[PDB]
Amino acid sequence: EMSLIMLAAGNSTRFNTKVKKQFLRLGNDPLWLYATKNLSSFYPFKKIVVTSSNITYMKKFTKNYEFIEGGDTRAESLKKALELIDSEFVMVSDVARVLVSKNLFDRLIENLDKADCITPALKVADTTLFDNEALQREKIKLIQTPQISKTKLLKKALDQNLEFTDDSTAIAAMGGKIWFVEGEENARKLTFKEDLKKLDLPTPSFEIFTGNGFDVHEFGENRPLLLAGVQIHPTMGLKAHSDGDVLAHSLTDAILGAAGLGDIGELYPDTDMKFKNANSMELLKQAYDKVREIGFELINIDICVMAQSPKLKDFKQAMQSNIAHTLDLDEFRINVKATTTEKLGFIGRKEGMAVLSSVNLKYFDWTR
Amino acid sequence: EMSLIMLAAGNSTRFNTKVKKQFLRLGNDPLWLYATKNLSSFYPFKKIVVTSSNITYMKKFTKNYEFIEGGDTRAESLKKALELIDSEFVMVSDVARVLVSKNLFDRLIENLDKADCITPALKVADTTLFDNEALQREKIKLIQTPQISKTKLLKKALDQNLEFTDDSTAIAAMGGKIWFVEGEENARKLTFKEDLKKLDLPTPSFEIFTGNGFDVHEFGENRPLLLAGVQIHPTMGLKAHSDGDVLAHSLTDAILGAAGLGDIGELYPDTDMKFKNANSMELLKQAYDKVREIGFELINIDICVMAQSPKLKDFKQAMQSNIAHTLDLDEFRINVKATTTEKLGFIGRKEGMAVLSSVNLKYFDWTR
Amino acid sequence: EMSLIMLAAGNSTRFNTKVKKQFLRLGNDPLWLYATKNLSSFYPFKKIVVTSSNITYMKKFTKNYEFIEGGDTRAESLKKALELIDSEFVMVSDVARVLVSKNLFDRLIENLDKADCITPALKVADTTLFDNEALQREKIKLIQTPQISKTKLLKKALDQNLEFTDDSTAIAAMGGKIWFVEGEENARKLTFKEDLKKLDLPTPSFEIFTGNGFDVHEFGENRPLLLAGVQIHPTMGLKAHSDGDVLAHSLTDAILGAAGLGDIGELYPDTDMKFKNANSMELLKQAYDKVREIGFELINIDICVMAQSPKLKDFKQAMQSNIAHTLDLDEFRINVKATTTEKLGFIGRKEGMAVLSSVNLKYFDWTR
Amino acid sequence: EMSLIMLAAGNSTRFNTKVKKQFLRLGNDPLWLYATKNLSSFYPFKKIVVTSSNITYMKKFTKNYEFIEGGDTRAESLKKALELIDSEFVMVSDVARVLVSKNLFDRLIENLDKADCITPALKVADTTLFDNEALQREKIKLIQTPQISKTKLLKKALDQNLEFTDDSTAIAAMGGKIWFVEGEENARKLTFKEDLKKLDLPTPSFEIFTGNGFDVHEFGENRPLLLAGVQIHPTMGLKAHSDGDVLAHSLTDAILGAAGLGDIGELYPDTDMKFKNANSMELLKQAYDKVREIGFELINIDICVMAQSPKLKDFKQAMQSNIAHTLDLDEFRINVKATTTEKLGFIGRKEGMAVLSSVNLKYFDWTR
Ligand SMILES: Nc1ccn([C@@H]2O[C@H](COP(=O)(O)O)[C@@H](O)[C@H]2O)c(=O)n1
Ligand SMILES: Nc1ccn([C@@H]2O[C@H](COP(=O)(O)O)[C@@H](O)[C@H]2O)c(=O)n1
Ligand SMILES: Nc1ccn([C@@H]2O[C@H](COP(=O)(O)O)[C@@H](O)[C@H]2O)c(=O)n1
Ligand SMILES: Nc1ccn([C@@H]2O[C@H](COP(=O)(O)O)[C@@H](O)[C@H]2O)c(=O)n1
Ligand SMILES: Nc1ccn([C@@H]2O[C@H](COP(=O)(O)O)[C@@H](O)[C@H]2O)c(=O)n1
Ligand SMILES: Nc1ccn([C@@H]2O[C@H](COP(=O)(O)O)[C@@H](O)[C@H]2O)c(=O)n1
Ligand SMILES: Nc1ccn([C@@H]2O[C@H](COP(=O)(O)O)[C@@H](O)[C@H]2O)c(=O)n1
Ligand SMILES: Nc1ccn([C@@H]2O[C@H](COP(=O)(O)O)[C@@H](O)[C@H]2O)c(=O)n1
Ligand SMILES: CC(C)=CCC/C(C)=C/COP(=O)(O)OP(=O)(O)O
Ligand SMILES: [Zn+2]
Ligand SMILES: [Zn+2]
Ligand SMILES: [Zn+2]
Ligand SMILES: [Zn+2]
Known part of the structure; x- marks a missing residue:
């Protein structure tokens, strides 16, 4: 038994323009719902929770999900959301990561027992610079999403510290063990204007x-x-x-x-x-x-x-x-x-x- | 000389939902007119008649065809319609059979003299069960449309009995001779929800x-x-x-x-x-x-x-x-x-x- | 230094119907602006001028171009427009010639010095009849557009005579020298209903x-x-x-x-x-x-x-x-x-x- | 009753390179046969004749057509070929004109009686120069192919003079009457290297x-x-x-x-x-x-x-x-x-x- 959290709250002018990116239209559905729909097709989750800076509006689009108000940060949001979760396991994902393939999901869940949090990651073959200063590229991991985590540990992992960017580092920084499954280009996070043309996103309905x-x-x-x-x-x-x-x-x-x-x-x-x-x-x-x-x-x-x-x-x-x-x-x-x-x-x-x-x-x- | 009848009357919840299937949009045209337009392109018919459960509405879409009110059944409809036909020959077809190819039409008309009614048919290669009971598959014929028939005989063929499902059995049950031309997958009859995805139908206009x-x-x-x-x-x-x-x-x-x-x-x-x-x-x-x-x-x-x-x-x-x-x-x-x-x-x-x-x-x- | 004139004025029922062809929609843009946009992408022109039979309307679509009222003929229009041009060189083109490729532009400008006006042309391989009477096909040239011309000479070339159909014959009829660069099928002039299906024109926006x-x-x-x-x-x-x-x-x-x-x-x-x-x-x-x-x-x-x-x-x-x-x-x-x-x-x-x-x-x- | 001549003889380095253009592969078929096949699909010709500079080779590709050796010119070829024709009518066409549409054929044959030779033609909207000298563009006709002609008159039309470029001028120069049907872009004559990319020609077989x-x-x-x-x-x-x-x-x-x-x-x-x-x-x-x-x-x-x-x-x-x-x-x-x-x-x-x-x-x- 496993529940799903879609983190769709907050807002910042990284991508942004005059238009919030969870509200971009992909087909008839806004991005946030498109993404939640996609993940939700993959598995019968006991509970689906979506974090929001726009509950009342968001709600006018479906009756399927429980919505909880977002926090100041991603972790803050996620803590709040976990408090609604009683299943042993939880899968958390960014809405901004729209086109997550069934393939990758199967890879996550087929390794469900090997460790405490399971995560997509990709290697880096380019020269990497941390602050205009070279870094040993082989030692780098780009961390994606979804991530499956044992609820109990994730709740505890966020009791104090709320600065964590993803589930893995949070579970890790509390002694828990992390399992890295190979990620994919489809799991990219829509963050910049430029990213849109890098994803095979369905163009908006007419x-x-x-x-x-x-x-x-x-x-x-x-x-x-x-x-x-x-x-x-x-x-x-x-x-x-x-x-x-x-x-x-x-x-x-x-x-x-x-x-x-x-x-x-x-x-x-x-x-x-x-x-x-x-x-x-x-x-x-x-x-x-x-x-x-x-x-x-x-x-x-x-x-x-x-x-x-x-x-x-x-x-x-x-x-x-x-x-x-x-x-x-x-x-x-x-x-x-x-x-x-x-x-x-x-x-x-x-x-x-x-x-x-x-x-x-x-x-x-x-x-x- | 040959006239055309498009049978587009009646209505039932086989396919149906809340939407009548003759009213589905394929391009700008509703199905019934799309189908009538397609057949009508193939030959200069002396008269084109369309049977209707919606004359007044239907009429607001063209000035080209004579519309006659439908009957309780397909034959009832067809009898009524024939009474408006004076050409020696008549081609009758279901609107539900939308994408009838020019090819097949040429096959019908190139055999115009061999018998009394001319019809598309297809063989069946699957085990066939009539009432959960096996039937000798080689002896089966799936009968399509259009069908060309000698007016005089078709009118007479429907004088009493009105239970006939197609022109061929009607002409046949009165001693007349039937000619079976090979049919096609494009001449399929749109009857079930599921059929839509089985036909290369033009998606509706925007x-x-x-x-x-x-x-x-x-x-x-x-x-x-x-x-x-x-x-x-x-x-x-x-x-x-x-x-x-x-x-x-x-x-x-x-x-x-x-x-x-x-x-x-x-x-x-x-x-x-x-x-x-x-x-x-x-x-x-x-x-x-x-x-x-x-x-x-x-x-x-x-x-x-x-x-x-x-x-x-x-x-x-x-x-x-x-x-x-x-x-x-x-x-x-x-x-x-x-x-x-x-x-x-x-x-x-x-x-x-x-x-x-x-x-x-x-x-x-x-x-x- | 070189300026651009788009001739988009006048109007006649050659192509026409009830709809002016500069007003056809190709994408969101009307033809005249689509064409001007395309040429204007190719080179930083010092000044862009568009001739118009519809200034006030035309103006509601952009702030980028200077619009001057059209004349009775193409030359009349062009004279009027040149009076707004001070650059040594000018490139004139018909809006009706919509899909002029960057390739061809490069060919025009790479021969900028060889003569007084530079022009696309195509040969003719068919039997040609001038008035039902045969003509030596090898001696024929079909003249296209754009054409680059030395401003000073073009202004003078149109001081008296205004019957000229293109820049080349005008410059030529005044002693100037003409350079013929190979034209293209994309530079065709949209003149007849039938031409539309002969051009890869973007279908109108929805x-x-x-x-x-x-x-x-x-x-x-x-x-x-x-x-x-x-x-x-x-x-x-x-x-x-x-x-x-x-x-x-x-x-x-x-x-x-x-x-x-x-x-x-x-x-x-x-x-x-x-x-x-x-x-x-x-x-x-x-x-x-x-x-x-x-x-x-x-x-x-x-x-x-x-x-x-x-x-x-x-x-x-x-x-x-x-x-x-x-x-x-x-x-x-x-x-x-x-x-x-x-x-x-x-x-x-x-x-x-x-x-x-x-x-x-x-x-x-x-x-x- | 009507026969067909495909003129496929001669050869010159206009298009050419090291490769004869009738021998270009479009599908499995060489151009000459591709073209002859296309025209031959359109009508049951009593006789099909193909003129050739390569009979023996050409023959190894089919048994359907009569081949006659080419002449020094197109007319010379055509005369020679007509001597094998006894039908009242004849349709002559250039192989180089590969993609002649059924549509256009129907236009030719639906006007079979109006005059002595029937021909596709297109108007010209560009400034036309005959020898760097302007010509009244409206008076020009670009003449295509096929052309249907009354055999008897065409044979006679070529008794002496053999300089004619097409059937129409030949029939015309002998007093006969010519009928101009609108031509098409598909009937273009493959004459220059550059023409290939201007035609929707099937790429060669693998x-x-x-x-x-x-x-x-x-x-x-x-x-x-x-x-x-x-x-x-x-x-x-x-x-x-x-x-x-x-x-x-x-x-x-x-x-x-x-x-x-x-x-x-x-x-x-x-x-x-x-x-x-x-x-x-x-x-x-x-x-x-x-x-x-x-x-x-x-x-x-x-x-x-x-x-x-x-x-x-x-x-x-x-x-x-x-x-x-x-x-x-x-x-x-x-x-x-x-x-x-x-x-x-x-x-x-x-x-x-x-x-x-x-x-x-x-x-x-x-x-x-
Ligand atoms: N009968 C009404 C009239 C006005 N209103 C509200 O009061 C606002 C101001 O209305 P007036 O501009 O009509 O004064 C409206 O935008 C509307 O929200 C309402 O709620 N019920
Ligand atoms: N306070 C926040 C900040 C971000 N988020 C969500 O978490 C995902 C990843 O966060 P960032 O894009 O901000 O790294 C985004 O889809 C965003 O909507 C949230 O639910 N609450
Ligand atoms: N001038 C009018 C007013 C009303 N009517 C009809 O009467 C109906 C009821 O109108 P009221 O709701 O205005 O009473 C309308 O739907 C309309 O069909 C009409 O036909 N001519
Ligand atoms: N009473 C009826 C029943 C059916 N029909 C038409 O005959 C065609 C075939 O009938 P069924 O689909 O009912 O077998 C359909 O296109 C339907 O519209 C008719 O015109 N009048
Ligand atoms: N307050 C108003 C009322 C009318 N008008 C103009 O006068 C015209 C005729 O108006 P009436 O039909 O209301 O008489 C309108 O089409 C409009 O252009 C205006 O410019 N200002
Ligand atoms: N009086 C005129 C006539 C034509 N023109 C433009 O010149 C171009 C070529 O002219 P024609 O199409 O009339 O040959 C067209 O794009 C047309 O809009 C103009 O700007 N003023
Ligand atoms: N001597 C010749 C010259 C040309 N032809 C054919 O006539 C057609 C048109 O001739 P041109 O391309 O030479 O104008 C070509 O397809 C060519 O193969 C011929 O059959 N005999
Ligand atoms: N006339 C020859 C014969 C053989 N050879 C080379 O000698 C090699 C061994 O040849 P035998 O197997 O014929 O002994 C060949 O693979 C070839 O490279 C040669 O270079 N010239
Ligand atoms: C579609 C719409 C909104 C139409 C408005 C026209 C209308 C019904 C005006 C009422 O007149 P009035 O209320 O000014 O008359 P009086 O005040 O004298 O009773
Ligand atoms: Zn107000
Ligand atoms: Zn009311
Ligand atoms: Zn009024
Ligand atoms: Zn030897």
Whole structure:
């Protein structure tokens, strides 16, 4: 009997960009789940645990695994996770190590009894420099994952010290015995931008996601009217909680809703007002930065500004242009339309204005 | 002179799932039309007739063929269809037999005069058991399609008896003579889930379909407020015709509209009220079940609830969660936003509430 | 030192259809930019100039190149463009010549000094007929592109005469010396429909574009009510500026907005009224004709007609059918829903009606 | 009723190298037969005639076609060939035009009655120069093949004049009417080295051919002993008919025998002695030049020199080296062994010496 831990928590700008690597799309599945799915196919684990910096989101993708909140470091994470494990044995692995082959798994498990922790390793044939200083290459081992370990010893191995980079050194530094099985190129750890092209990773699925956004604001506030952060009119201002950009909030909602990241108020509520100031376009940027973190990319934006006045004709290239700049996309993907309601309803009576945004999101093309 | 009948009517849960197999997408075309297109390329038929359990829908896909309503059985269907045929000869084929090669067609037609009905057949080299009891394998024939038959004889062959599974046995059981041309693996009949991977079928096109949905309901009804079938508030009910779920009807429309299946009222009208009760979420399920039958699958849902009150914040994970369950999709594909209209208009005055749904549908990935 | 001119202006129905060929999608990039990108990768040009019949649109795709308005002919265009060039040398090329290989470029530039203009050429081994009359095939040269020319001489070569088809004959007809480097099949000029399948062109990207459309019209005009150009009711007309088709204008906006071509008023404004008459469905056709010109194609239309009356039930197949005909798409891609607002708001009070359109556009599949 | 002529005669160093292009291997078949096979699949021709500069060789490849000896020119060839044709119609084609598609054939034959000769043609979109001088490109036609012609008129069309490059101009120059069907890129004429990579030609089959060679010469001739044209010994000469190189003749036979080109005496007989002089290595070169002409290339040579004396040890790198140079191959492909017969038999008694050559030939890799 043996359980599995997938360590998928933390986050750092090594690989990273604006997009977390556990959230890269390989097929329909995000990396973290792709990896967990792959390992989980190999063996009936008594329990599967996944460490996370994003439990609530992660959870919306499956019901199969127990999720435990990550720690400050890999070991910290792993300790926390082990406390949920009662099987005699445990197999721990990095999600970043996506394409671990069944072959290698069989090699690990066929040596289950020889020592206290079992590990893939590879030799090094190149001149190795530790700090611009030569090292005897034959004595080097590159250590991979998964690693199978006796639960009881691993829990104890991490009672005090939490600086260990892998299970093997942890078990080792407590007197335990280590068994080195030959590793493989498929077990590489996705750490740098450059690594992506070095792995036979499935390119992301072609699904496109839609989002809508609707927002209303009351007229009659003596300040400038800002839409997509372009100044439309010096006094015909909107009675808002921020700088009053109905366009920008409408669009924000649409971008969020497409990513299943709620709506604008779940992020930037009217109750707390460090948002009193609020440059809405910046709030929009930040909204998109969240969508980008979970592996999404805007295809296009279509906006429809419902307002009886003022005539937004002259300002429409300026609005499209500013969105493009803020959200960092080519100008052609942005389109701002406008319409009166022919004097009908609150919009037509001039009580306020509304904006209707429409968006499509694709999964980030990580093939550069 | 020779006409063509494509038998594409009926329906049964042999292959089936929630999706009719004539509606599977192979390229841009649904199976039934893909198959009819393929056969129709091979020969200038005087008339092409397609039997259907879905004329009105089927018709929206071409203007080339005459459609006749199907019968209770294959023969029943075929009789009905022959009554539209005046050419001396007729070629009948199952749509389910998609990839019939030009080669085999040439073999059929090059033997047009030798007998009364001409048919593909294959021998069997395996031990064959009729009812767990061995049968002399050499005496067996697996009969395929198309089959060319002399119209006059086929019409007569089906005057009384309608139990016949293919044209050959029908012509045969009336004294007529049958000619067996060698069949092929491409002429296989798509009957079971498992068959799909046994055929070199073109994978479905990557087109995504959009849908919008808008619905309004009046406030002031002393009962609970249900949205996506989650109870929001015990008394602030909506004045509806059913349980009053504006969300669920708005979403229903969007799912229907994306599939070109009309709107909610074309299915579930306010006139007839066996819908007086009406659990709207179940009506939604049923709506989706129609969309699924014609080869579609939801990518994502984005909903925007326009309501001045109550504050739906606390209930948004519960709404998303319930939709996911009802429509049987992963939770991450559902997003429910909400907005007041800042006291403006009927929504803002609290007269009623509106919901705006946005959806994308992809063609069903039948590669499992 | 050497600058680059990409000639991408003009337009004619040689290749053409309803779609301009510089706007065909090869990867994410339109042809003109794909081609300019390819050449621009080969050498650090001091200045890159692109000639255009569409500057404003073209500009929304990059910030890298200087765009100058095209002339009536290729030479006219080229003269205009040279006036922006101060480098000693210039390389001119047709955008239509998309896949020009690095190899051939190296051949051009490695012969930079031998003469006044350097050009790819190919021999002809077939019987050649000039006007059904045989010509000595060995004496023929098919002239390609790019061509490198000494700026000063090319400017002068086009001072008077502007009938020249390529740089070489222009330089030649002024006494200058021409150097013929062997051309290639990749440097072919995309001129006819048939040429597409003769080039290894990257198929278009799979991105889908969304568009929304909203339009309102006031009731109480004694004439017929036209929606999608189907007559709904003989007297319950809308107070419009044209024939009053709210559906058709709503849809027009959506189709435009998806293509980033603004909104309906940017095309067909209420100020000028040669649109007084206005058959809106024809205006819609024309709108789509613009979207088609820039490489887009409708996947589907979903429309939601907000109107308290009249009951549009009986007319919904007729509306879908008429749109299909006007926009020239299969009937199944069109869906018209309708909803009252349960007597609430201006719509529900019967003051006017609104329509909400939703659309998805894909890039034109030029593989036929 | 219609017959086919494949013109495969003549030869020139346009494409050519050391290898005739009708003899290039595409699959197992040489080009000429590959092409004839392709056209012959398309239609039951009453008679198939192939013109040849190599009847006797050509004949060893099939029994299906009538072969007639070629003329000095293409027309000369074609006249000669027509005299074997009695069908009303004839289709003539260049073998060099290998991959003519069924599609295009159907286009030719579906216009069989409209005029006197029917021909594929393509337009030209490039600037065309006739003798460095511009020509109105729209008036140009590139003429392809096949061409269908009325036999009677074609025979007459070539009664006097034989300078015509294709059937169309010949029929035309006699008043007959010409019909131009659109041609294709697959109908290109393989004329230049460079053309090969422009056609989707099947790469040659992987068959290897073996050859053996045995030759004996009597000792006791007061001159130098030459083997592979290296001087072995100043006086121990062989009593030959030429310079006496037993090695070189043995190897010649082996190279010929592998190519089914007979033996050395069929080329260079002892009766005629302009071979009295005879530098055998040059005769060997020439032998290989024949093998090269019919599409073959040496993989390796293994030679075994049976001689009781002299000891050839010191001269074996020099022999291998000289063969390599003569036959123009890398040195590693040549190996010369030697053996006495331990004083037994004529060899061992020193009456003469024998040489046994072994060779493998592959088909020329025309992919450069
Ligand atoms: N605090 C941390 C740090 C890393 N990890 C995971 O451990 C694996 C290996 O860690 P590093 O990539 O940081 O070396 C990664 O897949 C990462 O997601 C974790 O679960 N908790
Ligand atoms: N009925 C409503 C209206 C608004 N809200 C929330 O309040 C936020 C701010 O709403 P307004 O912009 O309409 O003031 C929204 O983003 C939404 O999260 C809600 O939860 N229920
Ligand atoms: N009542 C029926 C039953 C079957 N059929 C068609 O006949 C073909 C063969 O029938 P079975 O698959 O039911 O044997 C199928 O393509 C099916 O669509 C029909 O047109 N009408
Ligand atoms: N103007 C209208 C309004 C509604 N309807 C139909 O009536 C149905 C119910 O509409 P309400 O939900 O607006 O009462 C809709 O689904 C639509 O089919 C219509 O056909 N014409
Ligand atoms: N007036 C014109 C005509 C053609 N051109 C460009 O010159 C190139 C070659 O011209 P033609 O295709 O018209 O021969 C094309 O890529 C076309 O876009 C231009 O830039 N201005
Ligand atoms: N506030 C507004 C309202 C309308 N417009 C423009 O006026 C045009 C006609 O608007 P109506 O249909 O609302 O009269 C729209 O297409 C839009 O270009 C605008 O520029 N600013
Ligand atoms: N004397 C000749 C010259 C050419 N030909 C054939 O005619 C075809 C076209 O001729 P050219 O390639 O010489 O133009 C070639 O396939 C060539 O083999 C012939 O059969 N007799
Ligand atoms: N004429 C000869 C005969 C033999 N030899 C060499 O002497 C070796 C032994 O030859 P026997 O086996 O014929 O005695 C051969 O392998 C060959 O290298 C030679 O170099 N010249
Ligand atoms: C698709 C969408 C969101 C359409 C909005 C159009 C609409 C129903 C306006 C209501 O009018 P109103 O509330 O301003 O009328 P009044 O305030 O006079 O009652
Ligand atoms: Zn707001
Ligand atoms: Zn409702
Ligand atoms: Zn309008
Ligand atoms: Zn000899």
